Amino acid sequence: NARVFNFAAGPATLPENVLLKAQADLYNWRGSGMSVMEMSHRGKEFLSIIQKAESDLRQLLEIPQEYSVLFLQGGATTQFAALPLNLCKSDDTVDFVVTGSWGDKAVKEAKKYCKTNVIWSGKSEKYTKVPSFEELEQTPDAKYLHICANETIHGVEFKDYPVPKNGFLVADMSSNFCSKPVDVSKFGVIYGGAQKNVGPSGVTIVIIRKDLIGNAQDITPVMLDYKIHDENSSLYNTPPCFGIYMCGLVFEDLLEQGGLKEVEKKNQRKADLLYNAIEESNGFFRCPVEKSVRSLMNVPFTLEKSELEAEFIKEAAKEKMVQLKGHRSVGGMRASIYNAMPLAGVEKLVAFMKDFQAKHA
Amino acid sequence: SNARVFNFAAGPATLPENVLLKAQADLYNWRGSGMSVMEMSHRGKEFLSIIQKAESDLRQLLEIPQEYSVLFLQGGATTQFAALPLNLCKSDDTVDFVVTGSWGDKAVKEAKKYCKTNVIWSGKSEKYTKVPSFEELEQTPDAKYLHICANETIHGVEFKDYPVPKNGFLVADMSSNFCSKPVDVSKFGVIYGGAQKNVGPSGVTIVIIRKDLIGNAQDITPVMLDYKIHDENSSLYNTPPCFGIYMCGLVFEDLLEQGGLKEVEKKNQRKADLLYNAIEESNGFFRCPVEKSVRSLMNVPFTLEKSELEAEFIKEAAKEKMVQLKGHRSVGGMRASIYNAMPLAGVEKLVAFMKDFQAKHA
Ligand SMILES: Cc1ncc(COP(=O)(O)O)c(CN)c1O
Numbered sequence: 001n002a003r004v005f006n007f008a009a010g011p012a013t014l015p016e017n018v019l020l021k022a023q024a025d026l027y028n029w030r031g032s033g034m035s036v037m038e039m040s041h042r043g044k045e046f047l048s049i050i051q052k053a054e055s056d057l058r059q060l061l062e063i064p065q066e067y068s069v070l071f072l073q074g075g076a077t078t079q080f081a082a083l084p085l086n087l088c089k090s091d092d093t094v095d096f097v098v099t100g101s102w103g104d105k106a107v108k109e110a111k112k113y114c115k116t117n118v119i120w121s122g123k124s125e126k127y128t129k130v131p132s133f134e135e136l137e138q139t140p141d142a143k144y145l146h147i148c149a150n151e152t153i154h155g156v157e158f159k160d161y162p163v164p165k166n167g168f169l170v171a172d173m174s175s176n177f178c179s180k181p182v183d184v185s186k187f188g189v190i191y192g193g194a195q196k197n198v199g200p201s202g203v204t205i206v207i208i209r210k211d212l213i214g215n216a217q218d219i220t221p222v223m224l225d226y227k228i229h230d231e232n233s234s235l236y237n238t239p240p241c242f243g244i245y246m247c248g249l250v251f252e253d254l255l256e257q258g259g260l261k262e263v264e265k266k267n268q269r270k271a272d273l274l275y276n277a278i279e280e281s282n283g284f285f286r287c288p289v290e291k292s293v294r295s296l297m298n299v300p301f302t303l304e305k306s307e308l309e310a311e312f313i314k315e316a317a318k319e320k321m322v323q324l325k326g327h328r329s330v331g332g333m334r335a336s337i338y339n340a341m342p343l344a345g346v347e348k349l350v351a352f353m354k355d356f357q358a359k360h361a
Numbered sequence: 362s363n364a365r366v367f368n369f370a371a372g373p374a375t376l377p378e379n380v381l382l383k384a385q386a387d388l389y390n391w392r393g394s395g396m397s398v399m400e401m402s403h404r405g406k407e408f409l410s411i412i413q414k415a416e417s418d419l420r421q422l423l424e425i426p427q428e429y430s431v432l433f434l435q436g437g438a439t440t441q442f443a444a445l446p447l448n449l450c451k452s453d454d455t456v457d458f459v460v461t462g463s464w465g466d467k468a469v470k471e472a473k474k475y476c477k478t479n480v481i482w483s484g485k486s487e488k489y490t491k492v493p494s495f496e497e498l499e500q501t502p503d504a505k506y507l508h509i510c511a512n513e514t515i516h517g518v519e520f521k522d523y524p525v526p527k528n529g530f531l532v533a534d535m536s537s538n539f540c541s542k543p544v545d546v547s548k549f550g551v552i553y554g555g556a557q558k559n560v561g562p563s564g565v566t567i568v569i570i571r572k573d574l575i576g577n578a579q580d581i582t583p584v585m586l587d588y589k590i591h592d593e594n595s596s597l598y599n600t601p602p603c604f605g606i607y608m609c610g611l612v613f614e615d616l617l618e619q620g621g622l623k624e625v626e627k628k629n630q631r632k633a634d635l636l637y638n639a640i641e642e643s644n645g646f647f648r649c650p651v652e653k654s655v656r657s658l659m660n661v662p663f664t665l666e667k668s669e670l671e672a673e674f675i676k677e678a679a680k681e682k683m684v685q686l687k688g689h690r691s692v693g694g695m696r697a698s699i700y701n702a703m704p705l706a707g708v709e710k711l712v713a714f715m716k717d718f719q720a721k722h723a
């Protein structure tokens with residue numbers, strides 16, 4: 001049967017023209033006589049691919065030459081260790097602003113390798129807000145400030161960014177990467193797994209200011225050492241070649257769409273349809289997140305009639321809208337609406353919500 | 362070339378055509394699920410069926426006993442060079458190594474960050490052409506484990522039988538001969554390897570580990586390197602390399618269809634013999650430096666007496682659709698990597714090419 005509307009939160013839906021391009025290239029990429037999956041990573045074909053992927057990503061996000069771009073394995077969770085291993089001594093302090101459970105996971109891992117100060121946590125109001133930056137009390141000698149830019153489970157997204165009092169800003173942008181323009185120069189490090197907006201799982205992108213590379217802790221595994229990866233242009237060991245190729249296809253296609261200003265407009269448009277449906281529902285559907293920080297990528301919502309949640313999810317799936325189930329601890333629903341989710345999928349969901357409400361009025 | 366070439370790359374490597382064509386067919390919509398494998402939730406029922414079948418197929422192929430875990434991880438074999446001593450040793454423990462090539466040497470260097478190392482024997486002095494007699498190896502009396510690289514991909518040295526560890530257990534990097542032949546898994550505490558030679562694309566690393574060795578990692582172990590975390594979450598602690606795992610699953614299923622590892626080994630031995638016999642019968646025109654009894658079935662390094670002709674040999678072979686034959690910078694010459702999926706006809710073409718080349722340049 002046909003392709004479904006896939007609301008999965010990661011891995012996620014990918015552009016159909018990209019998938020079909022990959023299908024067409026799979027057996028024999030451009031007359032090279034082999035698949036990307038069979039290429040030497042030190043061969044001229046693969047080198048062309050990873051170089052074009054880097055150049056395309058630099059163009060898309062406007063990443064200047066003062067920053068390195070690394071294509072790594074291990075997921076964002078590997079970076080939770082790599083960051084303080086590379087950037088801190090064991091007795092340095094990192095500040096965290098914790099706006100959901102991904103930030104909390106980052107804090108717990110960093111505690112192995114340095115000191116951590118959680119200068120603000122949204123937990124007491126169920127992770128529904130971003131703090132006022134002026135009232136944060138930042139540690140005066142902090143090495144860096146870590147945020148999770150888009151909290152995938154909780155639907156809380158930074159629109160503006162804090163200015164570190166000392167040191168530099170590090171952001172986990174896994175679930176909103178390449179969804180909108182970002183002024184990279186405000187950051188020391190931007191990182192994220194590919195598997196929401198830019199490719200399949202198995203590739204993690206690290207964007208790191210060059211003056212911060214080097215001097216990792218002695219216990220840093222070679223495979224977590226940024227200087228090693230940078231000096232070898234992400235080919236220290238065998239990279240995730242097919243994944244990097246797929247990212248390259250996605251980056252190329254985002255440029256063809258008109259770049260990130262255009263991508264942002266589409267994302268804002270389709271998210272507004274869903275949030276407006278929720279707010280106009282007279283409480284039938286509810287989104288807990290404070291309006292100004294509502295994610296364009298992950299939309300958590302509940303039903304006033306909580307007992308109807310299983311029926312909602314099951315009937316949506318019969319209507320080809322899958323993976324709408326929300327997190328264990330609040331229940332309800334989560335609509336993930338990443339760059340490649342078609343406008344028509346969001347419209348189908350909004351129509352289904354309207355009909356469901358009228359039926360269970 | 363709009364025909365597929367004979368691809369002698371050392372990793373990533375050639376893969377079976379039937380596997381690639383199955384992946385092509387299903388890439389847009391896997392089995393009416395309505396999405397690609399590349400778009401599936403790792404916590405969803407479709408992907409769970411894929412990873413579970415991949416593990417089941419591998420357990421059958423290798424005859425992995427029930428008391429071993431199978432982990433599908435990211436990071437390559439190089440990440441395991443760190444994860445092994447982090448998980449298995451305290452910081453003042455010792456690991457013994459037999460070093461038969463440069464991959465083992467890299468494992469030693471990384472392990473030193475995490476524990477003490479002892480190289481009992483190195484083949485470096487004879488340019489990595491031999492395996493030591495095992496009984497005379499002086500093992501450390503309290504060594505936690507003994508590490509080998511079962512197939513040294515650059516040097517072409519392959520273990521046929523295995524040493525018996527004295528105090529601890531045996532760990533083997535089988536990256537470049539993984540699923541080329543039967544292995545008595547019970548002889549090992551850990552077998553590991555990147556998928557990218559014999560069983561899949563780059564991005565997936567397999568670790569087969571005895572369950573009683575899991576747990577008790579050093580406090581500084583990253584969560585992503587911790588065997589207990591991966592095992593208790595069945596390799597889904599974080600987001601796994603879903604598509605790579607899928608691809609490995611296809612390869613395992615095809616290796617079972619071929620008749621399993623006894624059949625795979627026969628084919629490997631047969632095609633390797635063709636190439637080694639061509640070299641030995643050439644009256645010194647071609648030379649392999651490796652001692653005969655430990656010559657790899659997977660990677661065949663060889664040189665020309667007239668070394669000035671090596672560049673032409675490689676360029677001319679590539680015009681004849683035999684690519685990636687250049688050998689390592691320290692010895693020059695050539696390296697023919699002839700993994701499971703390398704067709705017999707590719708080895709036949711190279712041998713015929715070698716014959717013609719010698720006749721022409723004799
Ligand atoms: C915002 C965020 N951060 C980190 C992660 C962890 O990424 P990975 O599974 O690649 O380790 C996720 C995964 N959903 C995420 O959404």
Ligand SMILES: Cc1ncc(COP(=O)(O)O)c(CN)c1O
Pocket residue numbers: 237238239371372436437438439440464510512513514534535536537555
């Ligand atoms: C025997 C062996 N061990 C380890 C490695 C390193 O593996 P990776 O690039 O996946 O880290 C290689 C790669 N050629 C290898 O051949």
Ligand code: NA
Pocket residue numbers: none
């Ligand atoms: Na201090």
